[PDB]
Amino acid sequence: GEFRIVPTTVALTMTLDKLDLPIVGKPTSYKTLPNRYKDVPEIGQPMEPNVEAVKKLKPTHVLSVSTIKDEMQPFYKQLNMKGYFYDFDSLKGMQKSITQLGDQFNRKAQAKELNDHLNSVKQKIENKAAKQKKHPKVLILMGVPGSYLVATDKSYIGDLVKIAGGENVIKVKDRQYISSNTENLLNINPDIILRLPHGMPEEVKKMFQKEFKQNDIWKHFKAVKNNHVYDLEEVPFGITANVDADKAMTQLYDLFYK
Ligand code: HEM
């Protein structure tokens, strides 16, 4: 009956805190984690947790997300444990994952409460957006160390943009993020460009700064000429959904309509 849970991502760690659940290990991260986990040991960075550190804690459940399912497969092989890859690529996906965690770990009531609140904020933002006469066309960039990608509707930020009343200029939908060259950025006409950082936010922002100066295409974008290029903070605007989606939805709506 006793659970020993290791969340391997920051979003999963924050979700377990909302569900009032103790954990035996936590991800290594520069982000703020819940205070109740201050004394639990770190088991490595979310994209490459330490197999032997995790095994040392004798867990019953080691938890990851769907966004990096394929690349986490070797980890789980060496661990020799069941892969859990909760859907955190949308509001609806994360709501389903919260219910599942409530069911697995005896926190049904806590899960319902969190879900009702997120649902209520989402519906309210959706209702406001629907009353707006105009909707901005949006291009979403996800910058990682070394390069940038383009976020689709299948990604969390794509879902937020949709909820808040934007129209993604990128229409392909079969993966969360695609090469900056996959859809070609000379066929689109965004009112707004969003730039989200990942992994090494400092390296990423300077990378975005150099790109927009150096690559000749950007100066020709009306979003650039009109100063509607926005750098979003990685918290709450992360590479997956998180329980602060209430703040993300509200903030993005307020950015779009101001
Ligand atoms: C060169 C490319 C990349 C590098 C070097 C990198 C590095 C990192 C780092 C340092 C973190 C931990 C951030 C922290 O301290 O909290 C992280 C987390 C994560 N990354 Fe990446 N990343 C890269 C690309 C990607 C891409 C393309 C994806 C998705 C397709 C991805 C998915 C994730 C996920 C799901 C997490 C966990 C988020 C959480 O903790 O809630 N990464 N990565």
UniProtKB/Swiss-Prot annotation:
Boundaries of every Fe/B12 periplasmic-binding domain copy: 4-258
Factors inducing expression: Repressed by fur in the presence of iron.
Cell compartment(s), UniProt: Cell membrane
Molecular functions per Gene Ontology: heme binding; metal ion binding
Cofactors named for this entry: heme b
List of residues binding heme: V10, A11, S29, Y30, M47, H198
Superkingdom of the source species: Bacteria
GO biological process: cellular response to iron ion; heme transport
Cofactor binding notes: Binds 1 heme b (iron(II)-protoporphyrin IX) group per subunit.
Function: Involved in heme (porphyrin) scavenging. Binds Fe(2+) and Fe(3+) heme but the largest fraction is Fe(2+) heme. Functions as a high-affinity heme binding protein and probably has a role in relaying heme-iron from cell wall-anchored isd proteins receptors to the probable permease IsdF.
NCBIfam families: IsdE (TIGR03659)
Protein name: High-affinity heme uptake system protein IsdE
Organism encoding this protein: Staphylococcus aureus (strain N315)
Lineage: Bacteria, Bacillati, Bacillota, Bacilli, Bacillales
Gene expressing this chain: isdE
